[PDB]
Amino acid sequence: MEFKDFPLKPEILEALHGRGLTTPTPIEAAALPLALEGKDLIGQARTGTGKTLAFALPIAERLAPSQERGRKPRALVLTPTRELALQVASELTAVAPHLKVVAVYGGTGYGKQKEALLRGADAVVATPGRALDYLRQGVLDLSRVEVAVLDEADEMLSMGFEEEVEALLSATPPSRQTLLFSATLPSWAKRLAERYMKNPVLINVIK
Amino acid sequence: MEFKDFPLKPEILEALHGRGLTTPTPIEAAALPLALEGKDLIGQARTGTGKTLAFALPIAERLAPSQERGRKPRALVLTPTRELALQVASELTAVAPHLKVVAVYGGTGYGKQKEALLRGADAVVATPGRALDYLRQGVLDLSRVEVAVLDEADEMLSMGFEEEVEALLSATPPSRQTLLFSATLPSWAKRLAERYMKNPVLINVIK
Numbered sequence: 001m002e003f004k005d006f007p008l009k010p011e012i013l014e015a016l017h018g019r020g021l022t023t024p025t026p027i028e029a030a031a032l033p034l035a036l037e038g039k040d041l042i043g044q045a046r047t048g049t050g051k052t053l054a055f056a057l058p059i060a061e062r063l064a065p066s067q068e069r070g071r072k073p074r075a076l077v078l079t080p081t082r083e084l085a086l087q088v089a090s091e092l093t094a095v096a097p098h099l100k101v102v103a104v105y106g107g108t109g110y111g112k113q114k115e116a117l118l119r120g121a122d123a124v125v126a127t128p129g130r131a132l133d134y135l136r137q138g139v140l141d142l143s144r145v146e147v148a149v150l151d152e153a154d155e156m157l158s159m160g161f162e163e164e165v166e167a168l169l170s171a172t173p174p175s176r177q178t179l180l181f182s183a184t185l186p187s188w189a190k191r192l193a194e195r196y197m198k199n200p201v202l203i204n205v206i207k
Numbered sequence: 208m209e210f211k212d213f214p215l216k217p218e219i220l221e222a223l224h225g226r227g228l229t230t231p232t233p234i235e236a237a238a239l240p241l242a243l244e245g246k247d248l249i250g251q252a253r254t255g256t257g258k259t260l261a262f263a264l265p266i267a268e269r270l271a272p273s274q275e276r277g278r279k280p281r282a283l284v285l286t287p288t289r290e291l292a293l294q295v296a297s298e299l300t301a302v303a304p305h306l307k308v309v310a311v312y313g314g315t316g317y318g319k320q321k322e323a324l325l326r327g328a329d330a331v332v333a334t335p336g337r338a339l340d341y342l343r344q345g346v347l348d349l350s351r352v353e354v355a356v357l358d359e360a361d362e363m364l365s366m367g368f369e370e371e372v373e374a375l376l377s378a379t380p381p382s383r384q385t386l387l388f389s390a391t392l393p394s395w396a397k398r399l400a401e402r403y404m405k406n407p408v409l410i411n412v413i414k
């Protein structure tokens with residue numbers, strides 16, 4: 001199936017098409033039917049393999065636009081590094097032209113990111129340390145998150161973000177949809193699946 | 208997604224709606240995009256109903272009509288029991304009205320099944336002992352198989368059909384597509400996948 005063969009808003013297909021994105025990778029192909037219907041998923045694939053559209057498209061399709069200034073984000077993607085946050089935020093912005101995406105990360109001051117969140121956000125793509133910083137401050141509000149994504153969870157684990165990732169998830173509504181991406185499914189990922197996910201479907205494309 | 212949301216022939220969709228089936232189960236939904244494009248997959252779902260269309264619809268879509276008398280089957284579905292051979296043959300028959308489906312199984316004489324195979328078949332649904340018997344007799348010809356399916360591989364193992372299943376798989380063209388369904392993924396299934404499957408995606412919906 002091409003992306004056109006999935007039930008996606010015309011605008012989203014248009015955006016995809018204009019970016020030379022036509023073909024889901026195997027993990028995306030298998031993930032989309034479940035993810036588009038709001039189901040929790042665990043995606044297991046070799047690091048670097050393309051899987052962004054397995055969550056980007058479900059977020060884009062699920063979230064309608066909003067203009068409510070100061071509005072809280074309805075999607076949260078946690079990722080290990082500034083580089084990935086910028087990369088993921090970028091791709092999501094492209095596939096979801098109707099949504100305001102804000103990247104959040106450490107290694108810089110608070111102001112700018114803080115003022116974006118204050119202006120409003122539809123999706124936040126964040127590193128866990130900085131995200132937790134903004135939560136306990138009261139700046140990042142996670143009480144309206146409908147979709148939470150854990151990107152490169154193995155690396156988030158190796159970096160020592162376990163406790164931060166869990167605190168952030170715990171701050172979101174349990175009724176949310178959750179998508180977890182782990183290359184090796186270590187003990188921590190299994191604990192996440194058990195505690196923070198609802199009957200997650202596992203898709204493993206390692207071969 | 209509903210069945211109508213997948214790229215299926217209108218007459219196949221008609222057959223489904225005629226049977227009162229509009230919505231894939233989670234295993235079927237996740238499997239369809241890859242199975243329809245001819246990829247190998249391991250579907251981990253509970254034994255019993257709920258997965259047939261994940262292989263029946265790809266067989267229906269992939270195989271064009273043929274009228275050749277004495278034609279050899281282009282799909283082979285193995286089931287662990289005689290009861291399931293009958294059931295799955297009936298289910299496949301209903302969603303592939305353009306194909307001739309022939310059930311093969313012990314617990315009765317050889318006459319009628321032999322007659323059916325000699326007249327020709329597009330898909331064979333079989334228990335492994337009887338299928339292998341017919342192979343040895345030269346009545347069942349597997350040289351044109353394009354899709355092989357193992358439905359409920361765990362029970363094949365527990366009934367002690369491993370040698371027969373492997374002999375049958377070995378008798379088919381490796382160029383074929385292979386779909387394997389099993390609830391628990393024991394060592395034998397893993398070694399089957401390694402020997403007889405091509406980079407299969409694993410989809411596990413076990414709750």
Ligand SMILES: Nc1ncnc2c1[nH]c(=O)n2[C@@H]1O[C@H](CO)[C@@H](O)[C@H]1O
Binds near residue numbers: 021024050051052
């Ligand atoms: N279906 C797809 N087609 C092309 N590029 C993709 C893709 N999915 C996906 O995630 N990518 C991109 O490729 C990168 C690495 O493969 C990802 O980080 C994305 O930037």
